[PDB]
């Protein structure tokens, strides 16, 4: 039953490798919102000046 | 003929035992081939259901990434539009 | 979320699969162990008759 | 003067920050596919090497089980030969 151990252990490490790589893309989506907020403040400056 | 009876049973049960060992070795080969079919169709069906989910997770993100970035460019064009309108009045 | 119950039915297959295979070889080794002991029993029957004939030949000879 | 130049500056930065972010995604998914495929093809060769170790241990069982039975039955046959020999010796003298 030692083979079933190493198989299940490599699957959990294979899942963490996906959850991390899925969290990296979740961070770059957050960096898109940061750029989307900086462009928001610039627009509000041009509107309130016009 | 009493010894001719026991010796006959001894020599025949040896022939019956050899034919039975051949049956066990043929059953052992059947079990191993079926133990390979089960673990060649299982582990295969576990790489498909773990590739398509990774593909669909990145499929959903690529749609959102192309939604925010395309909307980000639309807002930057409006900023440049309003800035040029301010350069003209001045 | 969805990858949990797919993988929860992964470990439950292999840990069940290899557990049956572990008990399978414990039975297949028993079949061969019964055949080996079947030989020794057949060899004891012959060794008994062996000493029954040598002690009768030396009785006459 | 100052107002329209500081606005073109912040926009040009957001132009680069948009271009730099897109280039990182194309470079992030590089390492996403360069590592996972180096773990997929890695785990395949490891599990296959674990079965080959087991399939050799199984061979050790049947290689020495056939050897023990083949050697005992070979001795068992020499025993039945020397018994059938002595019985015919007693069936002709008596």
Residue numbers in the entry:
A (entry chain D): 58 to 107
B (entry chain B): 61 to 150
C (entry chain C): 51 to 111
D (entry chain A): 57 to 150
Give the text the authors published on this PDB structure:
The synaptonemal complex (SC) is a supramolecular protein assembly that mediates synapsis between homologous chromosomes during meiosis. SC elongation along the chromosome length (up to 24 μm) depends on its midline α-fibrous component SYCE2-TEX12. SYCE2-TEX12’s building-blocks are 2:2 coiled-coils which dimerise into 4:4 hetero-oligomers and interact end-to-end and laterally to form 10-nm fibres, which intertwine within 40-nm bundled micrometre-long fibres that define the SC’s midline structure. Thus, SYCE2-TEX12 exhibits behaviour typical of cytoskeletal proteins to provide an α-fibrous SC backbone that structurally underpins synaptic elongation along meiotic chromosomes.
We obtained an alternative crystal form of SYCE2-TEX12 ΔCtip core, which diffracted anisotropically to 3.33–6.00 Å resolution, and was solved by molecular replacement using a three-helical bundle of the 2:2 structure as a search model. This revealed a 4:4 structure in which two 2:2 complexes interact laterally, through tessellation of S-shaped SYCE2 dimers, to create a molecule of the same length (14 nm) but twice as wide (4 nm) as individual 2:2 complexes. The 2:2 crystal structure is largely retained by the two interacting 2:2 complexes (r.m.s. deviation = 1.91), which seamlessly generate an SYCE2 tetrameric core with staggered TEX12 chains arranged on opposing surfaces. In common with the 2:2 structure, S2C sequences were missing from electron density, meaning that pairs of truncated SYCE2 and TEX12 C-termini are juxtaposed at both ends of the 4:4 molecule. The observed tessellation of 2:2 complexes provides an enticing mechanism for assembly of a 4:4 complex from structurally intact obligate 2:2 molecules, in agreement with our biochemical findings. The 4:4 crystal structure lacks TEX12’s C-terminal tip, which is required for 4:4 assembly in solution, suggesting that this conformation was supported by the crystal lattice. We reasoned that the tessellating interface likely drives 4:4 assembly of the wild-type protein and is stabilised in solution by additional TEX12 Ctip interactions. The crystal lattice of the 4:4 structure is a fibrous array in which 4:4 molecules are arranged in end-to-end chains, with 1-nm gaps between juxtaposed C-termini, and a lateral stagger. Thus, the lateral tessellating interaction of 2:2 complexes within the 4:4 crystal structure describes the underlying architecture of the wild-type 4:4 assembly.
